[model samples]
Target: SMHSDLTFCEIILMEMESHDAAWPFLEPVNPRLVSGYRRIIKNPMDFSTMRERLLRGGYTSSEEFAADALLVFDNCQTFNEDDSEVGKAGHIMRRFFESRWEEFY
Candidate 1:
């Protein structure tokens, strides 16, 4: 059951990584590049980390994977203005993920 759920999550992850607005979320945010990022976001999440965890079988269910995906956007919204590039992208990505997630669960 977990494997099947992870398969669904992996499909969603592949689509997200391919999205036009995915650049900002492709990897972990660089604290050095973004001042105070580490201080501001208590939990940092990104597509690459999700992929690695998925491949390593770190997730117990699709909900856990979804939580991390949502966290990526939550951290984005928390640190960036709504009108900012990353913020806008996060909104789009979050919407997209939710839509696809609904299709499955």
Candidate 2:
């Protein structure tokens, strides 16, 4: 069950990375590029970080994996406004993840 769960995370992550709105989330945000980024978002999460976790079997279960996955969007929403480009992409990507998660389980 644990192994399968990890695989599930891997599959979902791949889909998310390939998403059109995924560009903003494909890598970690640069603090230098975005002013006060580090100050605004306390916990930074990204697809690359998630992928690294998945590769090392860092996730104990699908639920644990989902937490970090959701964190990515959570941070996005906090740092960017609802109408902003990055914000809009985060919303879309989040919905996509939720839909895939439901279908998987």
Candidate 3:
């Protein structure tokens, strides 16, 4: 179904495969929103990806990360350091978990 979460998880695993890495982090599953995202823009990749980068780097608590994420993450047109859509999306998705962390707790 091309679920964003599915794509995100797959992206994460693929990134791990390159370096044999793994992520133990996961946010709550939104039962309310079918896709979890209220609105899906063009999925541009402009300034939004910074959020995920910060998250992967453990700067989640910083508002700078959140602001950056909201800016570029949804823009599918953008990308990561590896220039891989899947990898970038996965990182953004991982960061998204941090953005939504307090939901379940």
Candidate 4:
């Protein structure tokens, strides 16, 4: 999705609905809005392997926000090395929002 078309509420909603098996170790994102972004996971192997990751700390804080944030960052950061969607939770998230900055200010 285009960055300019995003809204604060939209991002929050999308993150909330996002059901990533592996979330934490990723990063934080609002869980009450949607941000319409697509991911390009070239290898299904990479995607499937994350189940163990999710199980590791998928719900660590027991708080929705904490877990989601962890996953979002871990997922998004891989793009620097491999262009393909590597991280399960964050790969797609990073594609959309840069930081809390994008949602506010």
TM-scores for the candidates: 0.96, 0.95, 0.24, 0.26
- RMSD (Å) of each candidate, 1 decimal: 0.8, 0.9, 15.5, 14.0
Off by over 4 Å in 4: 1-11, 15-67, 75-81, 87-89, 99-101
Q: Give the TM-score of candidate 4.
A: 0.26
RMSD of 4: 14.0
RMSD of 1: 0.8
lDDT of 3 by residue, 1-105 (tens): 224433443343334323321121122223355363324433333222432454365442344434444444333333223356545555655455454533422
Q: Estimate candidate 3's alpha-carbon lDDT, on a 0 to 1 scale.
A: 0.38
* Superposition TM-score, candidate 2 onto the true structure: 0.95
For candidate 2, the clash count comes to 0
Q: What C-alpha lDDT values do all the predictions have?
A: 0.94, 0.91, 0.38, 0.38
Best by TM-score, which number? 1
Scanning candidate 2 in windows of ten residues, the lowest lDDT window is: 1-10
Candidate that beats the other on TM-score, 2 or 3, i.e. the better one: 2
lDDT by residue for model 1 over 4-104, one digit each (tens)?
88889989999999999999999898889988999999899999999999999899989999999999999999999999998999999999999999977
**What's model 3's lDDT at 53?**
55
Q: What's the lDDT for residue 105 in model 2? A: 86
> Per-residue lDDT tens digits of candidate 4, residues 1-105?
223323333444355345452343223332333232224322222222333333443323223333344344543563334444444434555444344435454
Off by over 4 Å in 3: 1-61, 77-95
The prediction achieving the highest lDDT against the true structure is 1
